[PDB]
Amino acid sequence: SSRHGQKGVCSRKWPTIDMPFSETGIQPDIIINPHAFPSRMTIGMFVESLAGKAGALHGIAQDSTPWIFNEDDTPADYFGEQLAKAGYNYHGNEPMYSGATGEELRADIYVGVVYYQRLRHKFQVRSTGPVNSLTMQPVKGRKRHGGIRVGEMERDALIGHGTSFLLQ
């Protein structure tokens, strides 16, 4: 997660030859999906993206204390001006190419530097496994081959279907 309540679960460790790559010849460390934004309105992450890229370029720490900017002095303008002075696109977009096809993507894509936090934590699988002496039903476990339970919410589902053999 970034520092804006945009928490994500790692889906793939994507091979770098398969990632998109920038005009600058860089591959992203992390991808976050644009569809993760319009419902949450973490506009502060977009600001951090510009500011962080501009900071990495100019060798500059960027102050992001709340309420230092305002409507007559916006950060998108401020940091954008800084990117333009560095030689990158003022809106924080960058041209990229598909790792798979090799071709330039349809539009410039939004890229930058955002501080990320790794969140501390486990899966389980069972073939079969130890049962309890009295009921001969699967023991509770995980660390010993724990078996999930088909529950009554699952009973009701099986009736709603009537997979009677699955129930049996």
């Binding site: 924080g92 894509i109 529950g151 589902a157 009537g162 997979t163």
Partner: protein, 244 residues
């Protein structure tokens, strides 16, 4: 497959197994999130392996995903494409969209997977180009027509649909009719495709295909369209920014 809480039967469906080298997690197509109410935020699922042919038959014919296109609550779609795939569709099916012979053929093959159970033919069929001269060009709408043409039954007339999408004509310019979705004899002749057409959306194209040609064809169209848009996105991608 099962994700808890299991509050209706579609949170426990039968899936066909596909073993994948090098994976450490279960991989699940997006079209199923609706049913399972799954978010991909580190949520877990259970996989149960029935152990005799009666249970096999039931999981493949009764509790299997494929039928369960419509919900029993109101009889409406629960499976469709989302996000990238909707954005991609608006772009691919735009009037401004043209493709050379090379590109057109490549989009087709990348999404058809003719080496499947959908040997509707054992040869891929293509349309003639829309523009013959000065240069051979196909439109995006032709990619759709070509897709349907390769996955619907050949001994059966092409679908006929008059529908609408979410985008008003005014957005395209004077005189546009792109809000009107027209399928004649299986060909997309007018309109873009939208959340209203291959989202989980009553009376759109995929629900229409579901009625006329059955759930197997509709499920196939849905997967095909998914690869098409995924590929189209890898080739032209995706949208951001402050400027917006």
């Amino acid at each position: 497959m099962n994700r808890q809480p299991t509050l209706h039967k579609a949170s426990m469906m039968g899936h066909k197994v596909r073993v994948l080298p090098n994976e450490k997690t279960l991989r699940l197509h997006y079209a199923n999130t609706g049913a399972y109410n799954a978010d991909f935020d580190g949520d877990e699922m259970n996989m149960h392996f029935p152990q005799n042919e009666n249970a096999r038959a039931e999981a493949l014919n009764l509790a299997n995903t494929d039928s369960q296109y419509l919900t029993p609550t109101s009889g409406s779609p629960v499976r469709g494409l989302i996000q990238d795939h909707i954005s991609a569709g608006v772009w691919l099916t735009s009037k401004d969209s043209f493709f050379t012979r090379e590109q057109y053929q490549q989009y087709i093959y990348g999404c058809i997977r003719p080496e499947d159970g959908h040997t509707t033919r054992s040869k891929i069929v293509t349309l003639p180009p829309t523009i013959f001269k000065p240069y051979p060009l196909w439109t995006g709408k032709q990619i759709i027509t070509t897709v349907l043409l390769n996955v619907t039954p050949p001994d059966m007339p092409g679908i006929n649909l008059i529908s609408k999408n979410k985008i008003k004509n005014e957005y395209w310019g004077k005189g546009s009719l792109e809000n009107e979705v027209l399928f004649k004899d299986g060909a997309l002749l007018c309109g873009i495709l939208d959340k209203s057409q291959y989202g989980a959306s009553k009376y759109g194209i995929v629900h229409s295909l579901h009625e006329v040609y059955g759930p197997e064809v509709a499920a196939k169209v849905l997967s095909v369209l998914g690869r098409l848009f995924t590929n189209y996105i890898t080739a032209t991608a995706f949208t951001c920014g402050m400027d917006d």
